């Protein structure tokens, strides 16, 4: 395992149906090895000077770090918002056969 | 995008109502760009030798890394418990215009 | 605070009753200081040429970075999976007495 060669990316979505469309497509396209959907989130941020509280879904995405720029761009291309929240945090350690799988199921088309 | 220059911080609150109040507060004060609250969490740890399980709310907060010290101090004050659990993890990549927006709505 | 001396590990489990026995066991063995269980996740991934969506529980475990291999070995020895997902992310900043507490309850 090379530290930092896998990453967990977060993306938030307006509802569960868009989240699952997008989760299903990143995996079909091999941009990611798996996606965990966390429903029922409440997002709180400022917009147009006012504080909003939206009902959302958070996606946690496991992919190779070298693929996050293509993941992200795919995300921008389909996402309802027009500035989509994508962040990716490096995996330093883990289950060595899990990490390998992430690499396998996501490499070389 | 400068790697490491935005962090995602995670904070555990005893219930929705305090979590929402803190989340509102840190965003109004521009200590954070946005906060995701995740309800119906269960936390398990040792207390004075013995396993507990609490019912809580986990907050994920995005903000500039150089702001992590003040957010944490804000969270410490404001308080229910004595030791506030805040950890921040470095964001290495992501959607540039989004990360740019984080830096601007918390800017200096 | 030594940056990256604490880690946040994510483990995905089939249900609440499994995540909970593992959660209790890692805390008890002092492989971890604190575990949060996030219920009601959907996992999406390709298996056998098609998309699977399973109903699952995500655990988030705070512990000493130096303890992750022993954490991971234990998780793998008790976990129904057959390739359990365990990933760890370095905690670069946060609440120093909290982080000191993570180290004390898992002390070497």
UniProtKB/Swiss-Prot annotation, chains B, C:
GO cellular component: membrane; mitochondrion
Keywords, comma-separated and alphabetical: Signal
Domain of life (superkingdom): Eukaryota
Gene Ontology molecular function, alphabetical: copper ion binding; enzyme binding
BP GO terms, sorted: protein localization; response to metal ion
Function of the protein: May form part of a complex of membrane proteins attached to acetylcholinesterase (AChE).
Record-stated family: Belongs to the CutA family.
Record's subunit section: Homotrimer.
Protein name: Protein CutA
Organism: Rattus norvegicus
């Amino acid at each position: 395992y090379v530290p930092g060669s896998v990453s967990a990316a977060f993306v938030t979505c307006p509802n569960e149906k868009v989240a699952k469309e997008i989760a299903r497509a990143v995996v079909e396209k091999r941009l990611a090895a798996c996606v965990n959907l966390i429903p029922q989130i409440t997002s709180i941020y400022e917009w147009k000077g006012k504080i909003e509280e939206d009902s959302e879904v958070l996606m946690m995405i496991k992919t190779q770090s070298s693929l996050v720029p293509a993941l992200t761009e795919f995300v921008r291309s389909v996402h309802p918002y027009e500035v989509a929240e994508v962040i990716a945090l490096p995996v330093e350690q883990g289950n060595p056969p899990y990490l390998h799988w992430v690499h396998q199921v996501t490499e070389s088309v």
